[PDB]
Structure 1
Amino acid sequence: EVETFAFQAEIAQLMSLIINTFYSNKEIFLRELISNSSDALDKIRYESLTDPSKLDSGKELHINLIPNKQDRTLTIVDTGIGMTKADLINNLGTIAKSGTKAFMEALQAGADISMIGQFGVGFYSAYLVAEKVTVITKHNDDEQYAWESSAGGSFTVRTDTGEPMGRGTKVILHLKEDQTEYLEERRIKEIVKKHSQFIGYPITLFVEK
């Protein structure tokens, strides 16, 4: 049962801008995704302080970076708070609409794509290097979902019957043919050290094979 939705015009426009604008500093996508994971981890930790049972789905708070050359994917995994179906289909888009407007106005004023995170829409920077993005997420008290989009103005959502993850989010980046450098251990280590060296959670970079 796969449902297809249309991105709001503003988000579709943002994605097209990210995909079409000539901008060489693409590596910043990783920092934005790790930052999103860190925020999600901060939230579940905060909520667990008043309701310890929210960690029954997993006490470990961390981030895993998993590259796979055979599938040509780079997956950013976290055990943060996770997203509900409502987040994926309506709420995150509602919030992203205003962030997108501010970002594009900032761009015409002289800002550049690397500052996308200051507008709450850094997630979409994933399209700087991925032709398709698959997001698997599980929030307590909601089912595990699989969100997916190759841009083009639409995305899909389905209940994920794959391997249960407990709680958290996995952003699976199906890399563009000319962006496989982000599957190399050397490259990922360099980027994490450069832009995400102070994240307050363990970041484990898995090795290939």
Structure 2
Amino acid sequence: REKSEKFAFQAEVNRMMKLIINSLYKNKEIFLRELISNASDALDKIRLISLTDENALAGNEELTVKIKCDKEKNLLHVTDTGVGMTREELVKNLGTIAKSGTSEDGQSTSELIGQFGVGFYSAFLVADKVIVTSKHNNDTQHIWESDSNEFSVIADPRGNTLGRGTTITLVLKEEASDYLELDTIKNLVKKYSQFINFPIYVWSSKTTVWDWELMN
């Protein structure tokens, strides 16, 4: 009975605070860095499952990140066609968020915090809720909402919208509405995506008509 994980948990927690406060000094932009990173990792994951499964690309064939802004509603959407998440994985989340109403193995909370805690809690720099909608092969499509502390989860009323992958929805604060100005978000996505092997798109406009625009 080792019981030395509450040391690695502490280390990962401390790395996490270092970076989130680091970002809060300057950019505030680390949430977007992590949003693109974790999307790419989930694209990296299912491309890597397509080399022992052949049916793996049967809910989608594209391997994309698609970012859409809802200026009016004040939402930020980052959709990918990666591996997705089963209801099981969504309730484990990053080991730290418990179901709504309770305040009373597997992969350890330590290593989840290491890869996911930074992107999760940094969202709350600019957002008030983060909503996760995701579809894995061999489970249905669910939605997951958290306030930083607790979560609830349901099956998606719209059935299977994504085919495969995840949509991260950031209910933004009004203070941070500037992040949905098409021009500030394009340059951000251009900047943080230049070393992604996958095509990353922002929903944009010409002259006036809207379509996806490749940023890398």
User: Within the alignment, does 1:123 sit opposite 2:135 as a pair?
Assistant: no
User: Within the alignment, does 1:160 sit opposite 2:162 as a pair?
Assistant: no
User: Does the 8 Å CA contact 2:30/2:119 hold for their aligned counterparts?
Assistant: no
User: Does the residue aligned with 1:44 lie in a helix, a strand or coil?
Assistant: helix
TM-score, with normalisation over the residues of structure 2? Answer: 0.74
Displacement of 1:196: 2.1
- Separation in 2 of the partners of 1:139 and 1:157? 15
User: Does the 8 Å CA contact 1:99/1:121 hold for their aligned counterparts?
Assistant: no
The residue type equivalent to 1:121 in the other structure is G
CA RMSD across the alignment: 3.1
For 1:107, the equivalent position in structure 2 comes to none
- Separation in 1 of the partners of 2:61 and 2:166? 15
Displacement of 1:25: 2.4
User: Within the alignment, does 1:61 sit opposite 2:63 as a pair?
Assistant: yes
- Separation in 1 of the partners of 2:198 and 2:94? 24
The residue type equivalent to 1:30 in the other structure is L
Displacement of 1:121: 2.1
For 1:182, the equivalent position in structure 2 comes to 179
Distance 1:22 1:54, change over 3 A: closer
- Separation in 2 of the partners of 1:121 and 1:159? 24
Q: Which runs of 5+ in 2 are unaligned?
A: 1-9, 11-15, 97-106, 211-216
- Equivalent residue pairs, number: 182
Structure 1 stretches of at least 4 aligned residues deviating more than 6 Å after TM superposition: none
User: Does the residue aligned with 1:53 lie in a helix, a strand or coil?
Assistant: coil
Displacement of 1:45: 0.6
Match of 2:145 among 145, 148, 166: 148
For 2:87, the equivalent position in structure 1 comes to 85
Residues 68-79 of structure 1: matches in 2 within 5 Å?
A: 68-79=70-81
Displacement of 1:161: 1.2
**Structure showing greater Rg:** 2
Distance 1:182 1:121, change over 3 A: same
User: Does the residue aligned with 2:36 lie in a helix, a strand or coil?
Assistant: helix
Distance 1:57 1:100, change over 3 A: closer
Q: Which runs of 5+ in 1 are unaligned?
A: 1-9, 102-117
Give identity over the alignment, percent: 49
Match of 1:170 among 160, 167, 170: 167
- Separation in 2 of the partners of 1:88 and 1:96? 15
TM-score, with normalisation over the residues of structure 1? Answer: 0.76
The residue type equivalent to 1:98 in the other structure is S
**Structure (1/2) with the larger helix percentage:** 1
User: Within the alignment, does 1:193 sit opposite 2:193 as a pair?
Assistant: no
Q: Which 10-residue stretch deviates more, 65-74 or 82-91? A: 82-91
